[PDB]
Design a protein around this ligand. Structure first.
Ligand SMILES: NC(=O)[C@H]1CCCN(C(=O)[C@@H]2CCSc3ccccc32)C1
Ligand SMILES: [Zn+2]
Length: 139
């Protein structure tokens, strides 16, 4: 679990969105596993606007942060789960690292701010849904 709070927005994994996220929906994309809802309170997270390929992510199943090198956002084939059929997930970045069910929503950050959130795992890999292209989060 986990979300990004920026301005009057909350960014969560679409498969973990609550009834309240859907009732205050701003934007959602099943192909990215992202959903953004509006909030009454002001958020203070900073979103990176960069092309970093190194950063640090939070892994809740280890209560630890890990440094990682990650691939550029791309279309990656993801196996069927209870939330989605087998499909290509877009804007996904992979790194070698630990991630298991319950780790989605962990923030990946570089020196410029928030890069994305954990969205996939297994096999000694961890996948992050990129949010750096969502320039509207800052306006
Ligand atoms: N973005 C998606 O399509 C997600 C939806 C939830 C299920 N997905 C996983 O990757 C899960 C949880 C993250 S960790 C993990 C480790 C081993 C096997 C599977 C998983 C795919
Ligand atoms: Zn950066």
């Amino acid at each position: 679990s986990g979300a990004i709070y920026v301005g009057n927005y909350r960014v969560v994994n679409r498969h973990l969105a609550t009834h309240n996220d859907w009732a205050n929906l701003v934007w959602e994309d099943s192909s990215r596993d992202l959903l953004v809802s509006s909030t009454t309170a002001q958020g203070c997270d900073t979103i990176a606007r960069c092309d970093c390929q190194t950063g640090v992510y939070y892994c809740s199943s280890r209560r630890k942060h890990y440094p990682v090198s990650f691939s550029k956002p791309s279309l990656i084939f993801v196996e069927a789960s209870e939330y989605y059929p087998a499909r290509y997930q877009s804007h996904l970045m992979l790194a070698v690292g630990h991630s298991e069910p319950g780790d989605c929503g962990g923030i990946l950050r570089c020196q410029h701010g928030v890069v994305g959130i954990v969205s996939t795992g297994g096999n000694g890999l961890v996948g992050f849904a990129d949010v750096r292209d969502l320039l509207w989060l800052d306006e």
